[PDB]
PDB file of C-alpha atoms in Angstrom:
ATOM      1  CA  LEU A   1     -13.831  18.434  -5.970  1.00 32.82           C
ATOM      2  CA  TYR A   2     -15.391  17.743  -3.096  1.00 34.80           C
ATOM      3  CA  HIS A   3     -16.919  14.835  -4.646  1.00 31.17           C
ATOM      4  CA  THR A   4     -14.336  13.219  -6.205  1.00 31.94           C
ATOM      5  CA  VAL A   5     -11.171  13.513  -3.756  1.00 33.07           C
ATOM      6  CA  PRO A   6     -13.323  12.172  -0.361  1.00 34.35           C
ATOM      7  CA  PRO A   7     -13.819   8.094  -1.524  1.00 32.45           C
ATOM      8  CA  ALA A   8      -9.646   8.254  -1.616  1.00 29.68           C
ATOM      9  CA  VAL A   9      -9.564   9.634   2.008  1.00 32.11           C
ATOM     10  CA  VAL A  10      -9.416   7.160   5.242  1.00 30.91           C
ATOM     11  CA  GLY A  11      -9.831   7.205   8.979  1.00 28.26           C
ATOM     12  CA  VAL A  12      -6.799   5.502  10.923  1.00 30.62           C
ATOM     13  CA  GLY A  13      -6.335   4.008  13.252  1.00 29.88           C
ATOM     14  CA  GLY A  14      -6.609   1.178  16.607  1.00 31.76           C
ATOM     15  CA  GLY A  15      -8.445  -1.977  16.168  1.00 31.11           C
ATOM     16  CA  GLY A  16     -10.597  -2.187  18.719  1.00 32.83           C
ATOM     17  CA  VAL A  17     -14.970  -2.522  17.743  1.00 32.46           C
ATOM     18  CA  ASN A  18     -15.337   0.429  19.249  1.00 29.74           C
ATOM     19  CA  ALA A  19     -12.420   2.412  18.010  1.00 30.38           C
ATOM     20  CA  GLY A  20     -12.243   6.095  15.210  1.00 30.91           C
ATOM     21  CA  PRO A  21      -9.786   7.548  14.052  1.00 25.73           C
ATOM     22  CA  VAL A  22      -7.070   8.950  14.956  1.00 26.60           C
ATOM     23  CA  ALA A  23      -5.793  10.181  11.776  1.00 25.58           C
ATOM     24  CA  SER A  24      -6.830  10.176   8.997  1.00 27.41           C
ATOM     25  CA  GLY A  25      -4.634   9.191   5.746  1.00 27.03           C
ATOM     26  CA  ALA A  26      -4.850   8.807   1.622  1.00 26.67           C
ATOM     27  CA  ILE A  27      -5.712   5.620  -0.473  1.00 29.64           C
ATOM     28  CA  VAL A  28      -2.267   5.605  -3.087  1.00 29.91           C
ATOM     29  CA  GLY A  29      -3.192   2.385  -5.106  1.00 33.39           C
ATOM     30  CA  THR A  30      -6.087   0.392  -6.322  1.00 35.69           C
ATOM     31  CA  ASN A  31      -4.817  -2.785  -3.592  1.00 40.68           C
ATOM     32  CA  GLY A  32      -5.054  -1.482  -0.608  1.00 42.01           C
ATOM     33  CA  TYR A  33      -1.778   1.338   0.018  1.00 41.20           C
ATOM     34  CA  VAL A  34      -2.295   4.142   2.384  1.00 40.27           C
ATOM     35  CA  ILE A  35       0.148   6.705   3.387  1.00 39.33           C
ATOM     36  CA  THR A  36      -0.674   8.207   6.389  1.00 38.63           C
ATOM     37  CA  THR A  37       1.755   9.581   9.353  1.00 38.69           C
ATOM     38  CA  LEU A  38       3.833   7.453  10.971  1.00 35.97           C
ATOM     39  CA  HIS A  39       4.003   8.753  14.416  1.00 37.15           C
ATOM     40  CA  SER A  40      -0.131   8.107  14.201  1.00 35.44           C
ATOM     41  CA  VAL A  41       0.831   4.547  14.003  1.00 34.58           C
ATOM     42  CA  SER A  42       3.506   3.389  15.377  1.00 34.92           C
ATOM     43  CA  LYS A  43       2.534   2.680  18.954  1.00 31.95           C
ATOM     44  CA  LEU A  44      -0.941   1.322  17.779  1.00 32.11           C
ATOM     45  CA  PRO A  45      -1.132  -2.511  18.697  1.00 33.67           C
ATOM     46  CA  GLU A  46      -3.024  -2.929  15.208  1.00 33.93           C
ATOM     47  CA  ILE A  47      -3.879  -1.078  12.762  1.00 32.20           C
ATOM     48  CA  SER A  48      -7.297  -0.405  11.093  1.00 31.97           C
ATOM     49  CA  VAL A  49      -8.271   1.974   8.115  1.00 31.82           C
ATOM     50  CA  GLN A  50     -11.849   3.058   7.643  1.00 32.41           C
ATOM     51  CA  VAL A  51     -13.446   3.900   4.377  1.00 32.78           C
ATOM     52  CA  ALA A  52     -16.925   5.529   3.295  1.00 32.33           C
ATOM     53  CA  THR A  53     -18.567   3.325   1.064  1.00 33.04           C
ATOM     54  CA  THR A  54     -22.414   3.796  -0.586  1.00 31.13           C
ATOM     55  CA  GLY A  55     -23.902   1.953   3.095  1.00 31.26           C
ATOM     56  CA  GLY A  56     -21.605   3.614   5.323  1.00 30.06           C
ATOM     57  CA  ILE A  57     -18.123   3.163   6.933  1.00 28.11           C
ATOM     58  CA  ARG A  58     -16.291  -0.181   6.344  1.00 27.13           C
ATOM     59  CA  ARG A  59     -13.001  -1.268   7.625  1.00 28.60           C
ATOM     60  CA  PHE A  60      -9.946  -3.200   6.785  1.00 28.09           C
ATOM     61  CA  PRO A  61      -6.926  -4.803   8.716  1.00 28.00           C
ATOM     62  CA  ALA A  62      -3.625  -3.043   7.686  1.00 33.58           C
ATOM     63  CA  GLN A  63       0.154  -3.919   8.373  1.00 33.93           C
ATOM     64  CA  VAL A  64       2.870  -1.510   7.840  1.00 32.91           C
ATOM     65  CA  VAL A  65       5.584  -2.180   4.734  1.00 31.49           C
ATOM     66  CA  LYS A  66       7.314   0.796   4.625  1.00 30.14           C
ATOM     67  CA  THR A  67       7.875   3.350   6.628  1.00 29.11           C
ATOM     68  CA  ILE A  68       9.809   6.140   5.905  1.00 27.55           C
ATOM     69  CA  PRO A  69      10.785   7.619   9.452  1.00 25.14           C
ATOM     70  CA  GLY A  70      13.190  11.548   7.844  1.00 25.95           C
ATOM     71  CA  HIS A  71       9.429  11.996   6.318  1.00 26.46           C
ATOM     72  CA  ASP A  72       7.291  11.016   9.300  1.00 27.60           C
ATOM     73  CA  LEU A  73       5.304   8.226   6.733  1.00 27.69           C
ATOM     74  CA  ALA A  74       3.945   5.466   6.727  1.00 27.97           C
ATOM     75  CA  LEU A  75       3.106   2.806   4.103  1.00 25.01           C
ATOM     76  CA  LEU A  76       0.329   0.297   4.400  1.00 22.74           C
ATOM     77  CA  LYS A  77      -1.563  -1.604   2.977  1.00 21.33           C
ATOM     78  CA  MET A  78      -4.683  -3.165   3.601  1.00 23.24           C
ATOM     79  CA  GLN A  79      -5.547  -6.978   4.466  1.00 23.33           C
ATOM     80  CA  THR A  80      -9.134  -6.927   1.472  1.00 24.97           C
ATOM     81  CA  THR A  81      -9.258  -8.148  -2.051  1.00 24.91           C
ATOM     82  CA  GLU A  82     -11.048  -5.817  -2.358  1.00 26.70           C
ATOM     83  CA  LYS A  83     -10.155  -2.579  -4.655  1.00 25.65           C
ATOM     84  CA  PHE A  84      -9.800   0.577  -4.186  1.00 26.80           C
ATOM     85  CA  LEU A  85     -10.460   4.224  -6.338  1.00 26.34           C
ATOM     86  CA  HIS A  86      -7.214   5.834  -5.202  1.00 24.39           C
ATOM     87  CA  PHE A  87      -5.079   8.723  -5.843  1.00 25.18           C
ATOM     88  CA  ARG A  88      -3.195   8.430  -9.651  1.00 26.40           C
ATOM     89  CA  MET A  89       0.812   8.948  -8.520  1.00 26.05           C
ATOM     90  CA  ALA A  90       1.558   9.522 -11.930  1.00 22.33           C
ATOM     91  CA  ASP A  91      -0.769  12.995 -11.575  1.00 26.06           C
ATOM     92  CA  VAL A  92       1.363  13.988  -8.101  1.00 26.61           C
ATOM     93  CA  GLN A  93       2.026  17.665  -8.820  1.00 28.22           C
ATOM     94  CA  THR A  94       3.691  20.360  -7.001  1.00 31.11           C
ATOM     95  CA  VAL A  95       2.217  23.255  -5.788  1.00 32.62           C
ATOM     96  CA  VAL A  96       3.431  26.822  -4.943  1.00 34.64           C
ATOM     97  CA  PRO A  97       3.329  30.208  -2.554  1.00 37.58           C
ATOM     98  CA  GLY A  98       0.359  31.807  -3.313  1.00 40.68           C
ATOM     99  CA  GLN A  99      -1.656  28.745  -4.641  1.00 41.51           C
ATOM    100  CA  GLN A 100      -4.575  27.575  -3.550  1.00 38.47           C
ATOM    101  CA  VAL A 101      -4.384  23.928  -2.222  1.00 39.79           C
ATOM    102  CA  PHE A 102      -7.358  21.566   0.028  1.00 37.35           C
ATOM    103  CA  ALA A 103      -6.819  19.917   2.643  1.00 36.87           C
ATOM    104  CA  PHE A 104      -8.805  16.501   3.507  1.00 38.20           C
ATOM    105  CA  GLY A 105      -9.111  13.945   6.046  1.00 39.27           C
ATOM    106  CA  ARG A 106     -12.007  12.115   8.318  1.00 37.26           C
ATOM    107  CA  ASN A 107     -12.816  12.586  11.540  1.00 39.59           C
ATOM    108  CA  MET A 108     -13.525  10.351  14.770  1.00 41.36           C
ATOM    109  CA  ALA A 109     -16.956   9.055  13.114  1.00 42.64           C
ATOM    110  CA  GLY A 110     -15.887   8.612  10.028  1.00 44.96           C
ATOM    111  CA  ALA A 111     -17.473  12.027   8.488  1.00 45.61           C
ATOM    112  CA  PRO A 112     -15.242  13.981   5.626  1.00 49.71           C
ATOM    113  CA  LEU A 113     -13.387  17.124   6.589  1.00 52.51           C
ATOM    114  CA  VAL A 114     -11.614  19.408   4.114  1.00 53.98           C
ATOM    115  CA  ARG A 115     -10.607  23.584   4.294  1.00 57.82           C
ATOM    116  CA  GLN A 116      -9.205  25.551   2.090  1.00 56.68           C
ATOM    117  CA  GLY A 117      -5.968  28.231   2.033  1.00 54.87           C
ATOM    118  CA  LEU A 118      -2.994  28.952   0.409  1.00 55.71           C
ATOM    119  CA  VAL A 119       0.158  27.282  -0.031  1.00 55.36           C
ATOM    120  CA  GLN A 120       2.230  29.747   2.294  1.00 50.95           C
ATOM    121  CA  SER A 121       5.612  28.149   2.415  1.00 52.52           C
ATOM    122  CA  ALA A 122       7.678  25.762   0.030  1.00 52.50           C
ATOM    123  CA  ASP A 123      10.477  25.526   2.496  1.00 54.38           C
ATOM    124  CA  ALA A 124       9.915  24.882   6.182  1.00 56.74           C
ATOM    125  CA  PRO A 125      11.333  22.495   8.792  1.00 56.41           C
ATOM    126  CA  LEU A 126       8.970  20.632  11.658  1.00 59.85           C
ATOM    127  CA  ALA A 127      10.058  18.531  14.845  1.00 62.03           C
ATOM    128  CA  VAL A 128       8.119  15.533  15.353  1.00 60.16           C
ATOM    129  CA  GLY A 129       9.593  14.064  18.428  1.00 62.39           C
ATOM    130  CA  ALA A 130      13.246  13.800  17.589  1.00 62.53           C
ATOM    131  CA  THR A 131      12.742  13.632  13.433  1.00 62.56           C
ATOM    132  CA  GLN A 132      14.072  17.128  12.328  1.00 58.45           C
ATOM    133  CA  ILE A 133      12.338  17.385   9.093  1.00 62.24           C
ATOM    134  CA  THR A 134      13.387  20.061   6.518  1.00 63.83           C
ATOM    135  CA  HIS A 135      11.366  21.197   3.484  1.00 62.62           C
ATOM    136  CA  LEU A 136       8.156  21.478   4.054  1.00 58.67           C
ATOM    137  CA  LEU A 137       5.194  23.093   2.629  1.00 59.06           C
ATOM    138  CA  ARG A 138       3.179  25.362   4.609  1.00 58.30           C
ATOM    139  CA  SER A 139      -0.341  26.336   4.717  1.00 59.86           C
ATOM    140  CA  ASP A 140      -3.754  27.158   6.788  1.00 57.37           C
ATOM    141  CA  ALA A 141      -5.788  24.760   5.033  1.00 55.81           C
ATOM    142  CA  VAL A 142      -5.274  22.444   7.603  1.00 51.81           C
ATOM    143  CA  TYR A 143      -6.877  23.611  11.624  1.00 54.51           C
ATOM    144  CA  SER A 144      -7.506  20.447  12.878  1.00 54.40           C
ATOM    145  CA  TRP A 145      -5.396  17.519  14.012  1.00 52.88           C
ATOM    146  CA  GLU A 146      -7.956  15.430  12.973  1.00 53.00           C
ATOM    147  CA  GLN A 147      -6.336  15.805   9.500  1.00 54.67           C
ATOM    148  CA  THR A 148      -2.753  14.875   9.843  1.00 51.67           C
ATOM    149  CA  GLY A 149      -2.006  11.840   7.279  1.00 52.82           C
ATOM    150  CA  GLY A 150      -4.837  12.673   5.592  1.00 52.04           C
ATOM    151  CA  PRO A 151      -4.240  14.679   1.829  1.00 50.33           C
ATOM    152  CA  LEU A 152      -3.611  18.193  -0.149  1.00 51.31           C
ATOM    153  CA  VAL A 153      -4.558  18.381  -3.696  1.00 47.85           C
ATOM    154  CA  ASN A 154      -4.664  21.103  -5.991  1.00 46.74           C
ATOM    155  CA  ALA A 155      -7.784  22.532  -7.757  1.00 45.55           C
ATOM    156  CA  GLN A 156      -7.326  20.133  -9.725  1.00 41.30           C
ATOM    157  CA  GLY A 157      -7.002  17.525  -7.639  1.00 39.02           C
ATOM    158  CA  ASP A 158      -4.147  16.197  -7.826  1.00 39.97           C
ATOM    159  CA  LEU A 159      -2.346  14.818  -4.725  1.00 41.27           C
ATOM    160  CA  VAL A 160       0.269  17.074  -3.842  1.00 40.30           C
ATOM    161  CA  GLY A 161       1.283  15.813  -0.387  1.00 37.31           C
ATOM    162  CA  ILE A 162       0.143  14.545   3.143  1.00 39.39           C
ATOM    163  CA  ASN A 163      -0.202  16.866   6.822  1.00 40.08           C
ATOM    164  CA  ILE A 164       0.696  17.478   9.570  1.00 38.58           C
ATOM    165  CA  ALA A 165      -0.734  19.573  12.120  1.00 41.70           C
ATOM    166  CA  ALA A 166       1.841  20.811  14.393  1.00 42.29           C
ATOM    167  CA  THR A 167       1.521  23.089  18.159  1.00 42.83           C
ATOM    168  CA  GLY A 168       2.515  26.934  17.779  1.00 41.27           C
ATOM    169  CA  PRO A 169       4.340  28.098  20.922  1.00 41.56           C
ATOM    170  CA  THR A 170       0.810  30.007  21.665  1.00 40.51           C
ATOM    171  CA  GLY A 171      -0.863  26.712  20.957  1.00 40.14           C
ATOM    172  CA  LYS A 172      -1.941  28.102  17.047  1.00 38.74           C
ATOM    173  CA  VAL A 173      -2.525  25.183  15.031  1.00 39.39           C
ATOM    174  CA  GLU A 174       0.333  25.297  11.696  1.00 39.79           C
ATOM    175  CA  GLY A 175      -0.274  23.433   8.911  1.00 38.57           C
ATOM    176  CA  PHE A 176       2.717  21.581   7.378  1.00 41.55           C
ATOM    177  CA  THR A 177       3.150  19.298   4.695  1.00 41.11           C
ATOM    178  CA  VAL A 178       5.432  16.076   3.620  1.00 40.67           C
ATOM    179  CA  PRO A 179       5.716  17.120  -0.422  1.00 41.71           C
ATOM    180  CA  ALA A 180       4.231  13.759  -2.461  1.00 43.70           C
ATOM    181  CA  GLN A 181       7.631  13.595  -4.374  1.00 42.70           C
ATOM    182  CA  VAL A 182       8.739  12.062  -0.240  1.00 42.41           C
ATOM    183  CA  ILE A 183       6.251   9.179  -1.513  1.00 42.83           C
ATOM    184  CA  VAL A 184       7.521   8.323  -4.964  1.00 43.45           C
ATOM    185  CA  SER A 185      11.212   8.598  -4.722  1.00 47.11           C
ATOM    186  CA  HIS A 186      11.055   6.375  -1.529  1.00 47.90           C
ATOM    187  CA  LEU A 187       9.209   3.948  -3.302  1.00 45.23           C
ATOM    188  CA  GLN A 188       9.700   1.261  -5.601  1.00 43.63           C
ATOM    189  CA  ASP A 189       6.875  -2.260  -5.603  1.00 41.92           C
TER     190      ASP A 189
END
């Protein structure tokens, strides 16, 4: 699993040469579609997506194609003629409390992050700035802010959702997750 999922896990950040990922994202289409969290890229002047290859990190400029503000998601398209391995939206599955899930990300250096955990809730609300997002998943697989925007998968490696790391009142990290059907159903082309 830790072999076949990471290639579709990207880093996302600004366009500076010396800039690295500020969040993660998931490649969801051959021609360079990335889903990531909206609050991570909306204030960025330029967006660059960082992709792992056998020869090291490759960077591609990206633009926003569609925003899903109600669920803090953004859909990017990389500007490239290259083709990518991706999550197959057909294979998108749901999860239930108790189920085991895996949250992937890339750090500020482009290295892969994975953490395992259980689904603790399948209906939690979250406040990202002014938006009240509802019906979120909740899981302890999300321990780090660098995991925000990256994918949650099940044990078979199907895309299950997109992760949001949030702040507790005590400052403890709590894992949240936008269910992956929010992707298919707020999308068309």
